[PDB]
């Protein structure tokens, strides 16, 4: 009934009134480790110690070495399934590696580009599976690269749709991906999805897969995902230069104090370093030795990620319990229960996402902007909301999610009622 | 006139004897010696359990593009720049210069008519010579045309500079090392700075790339007073003209230090808007390391005096060896820098490329002839850069003495022809 809707809306008004009265100051936008997680690697603050030399004898305190410490690259070679000469180590930002590679592609073109992308006078286009990473889209938006949203399925993106786009459009030069524990879909690419993406024919000869494996070992269970050899499949398929692989220890060690990694064919490595050499003499070797001494080996990082999991998994479980209690009866919402990564993706009643965050903002609860997971912040259904549960304490988290549920219910009946 | 031929023979035997000694030395590495890096070995155990900066910031976590205020304050004093006008980045000041050029080409400066890549009249930079090869590699790779400018004693030819910038709108910038130049060793005078920030430009978005890389890198016990290039520019109505750069790569660890960028509040906001598309923020833990290590600006000055104790004898050694073997024949000239990391040696014209070839054939690595010029084009084929910071004093004297043997042989060789 329209009248029983009006009755429920009133109950939601009192709950919002009561929630507003609690005058809170919570935040669900911070995709950063908690202080408890960062304590796990406090040994780094005293590393490397007096021994400033890596196992090869190189003085990490002095200029030199573009590829990075081989000992550290060997640890993540195993974790990612990439050969050491196909993997380099940079500074504190993997996003900076992605941005530089896009900027190099526009200014100088890829290793096999017909011309720099800026010289294509009609334009450049990237494919962006949604919901996706906002900072992925900020790179292409700032660089004038147009972005084409792609639906996300269970085992990866819509490969049928991608294969038709890249076949007809030479302007499509790349695609943003998070192939493991997607931000924020939580979706991990299947072996078949990987196989077809590196095999599909592209109108652009220099099409690139931006393989941001940012959560490669960031499990929320006791199981670690088997990495698909995207570089090996691409080489066997005749497209060795297609994948650009990225990873980072920002959510393994310190967020912003870790090490970044880039992986690709030997030509792509040489191509990137030729232009990165005009920018920097080389990366920070001392921090790379800090992580080498701290980790020890690849089995060490795996154990380190299980201590992160012990801190993180109860928080993801709490968000699922609160949303299930407040919202399952309403049948207005759906949300992921991810096996890894740092984000839960919540879908509320269409046309209420922007309203839900506005209502939450004015009771002291900061929520990720509606549409952040989409290029140009354009969620066509006005329903998606990203939830970042890693940082706040369990009690702060319990109240933020419970408050967010109250606003989502109020915004729901408000939309059904007045329209 | 054949007394030349008599001397050439003596030079041939000295080269023959030099070659027979089968050396393997290097005067190319512009790096601190291991002894210099040892002064900063306390950094290898810093910051310690207290991961928080004086403001309470957890440096281990995401956030903050400006950098730690405590460290920015230390170098605010050392450079003569207000703290809000200065930011701290990662381990490379060269990467700040590259990004700012790339931002200027793709997006244009804070007050540019259009991105530089959209200029059909091309983009041009003025490059005082002898200069920094990595400065020129940026503009060379970016397709920016480079204009060599002669260096005088108090700075570059400002009269020539003011003529070019006044008539050519395509001239958008200029590469400078304002104190202890790489490799001229020249420090810009107050008058030269005042004119460069006051000269009027055909390009409304002209930029002084003020790479103050050797700002506190003295080879005496006195420190150079920094010119307030930003204040003079602001009072002259060109607040956005200077981009200031500095580094701790020659202060602490080469490649493990902190970089700095300075400018007007608009240029800081302009840079950070596009640097935010590139990175969530710089390494705050390493900036906390240097803050704990330095303590204050007076600590950095003391640290630079420890570097001077190691560096000054090496520059004095190179001067003594070149004066001994070369001054009598009057073919060569070289700088005696009061600071910086490089000595600039000029031999006879048409001799540099031959001198480095002769030196490479005796196991002595000399920096490529012309490397201090855009496109490596030394029109007189005479300049040779000497980097005396890294090798041992014995290794240094042998390489420099061997260098003089080759320069004299290539001199006599050319005189005949
Ligand atoms: C998918 C993805 N890529 C990149 C990043 C940024 O990582 P980094 O610290 O290496 O720049 C994030 C962090 O949230 C992310 O979720
Ligand atoms: C050595 C030097 C630098 C050092 O820059 P980093 O990227 O921090 O290593 C910068 N400018 C000049 C002119 C130099 O000689």
Automatic annotation (TrEMBL), chain A:
<protein>
    <submittedName>
        <fullName>Aminotransferase</fullName>
    </submittedName>
</protein>
<dbReference type="GO" id="GO:0004069">
    <property type="term" value="F:L-aspartate:2-oxoglutarate aminotransferase activity"/>
</dbReference>
<dbReference type="InterPro" id="IPR024551">
    <property type="entry name" value="AspAT_Ic"/>
</dbReference>
<keyword id="KW-0808">Transferase</keyword>
<dbReference type="InterPro" id="IPR015422">
    <property type="entry name" value="PyrdxlP-dep_Trfase_small"/>
</dbReference>
<dbReference type="InterPro" id="IPR015421">
    <property type="entry name" value="PyrdxlP-dep_Trfase_major"/>
</dbReference>
<dbReference type="InterPro" id="IPR015424">
    <property type="entry name" value="PyrdxlP-dep_Trfase"/>
</dbReference>
<keyword id="KW-0032">Aminotransferase</keyword>
<dbReference type="Pfam" id="PF12897">
    <property type="entry name" value="Asp_aminotransf"/>
</dbReference>
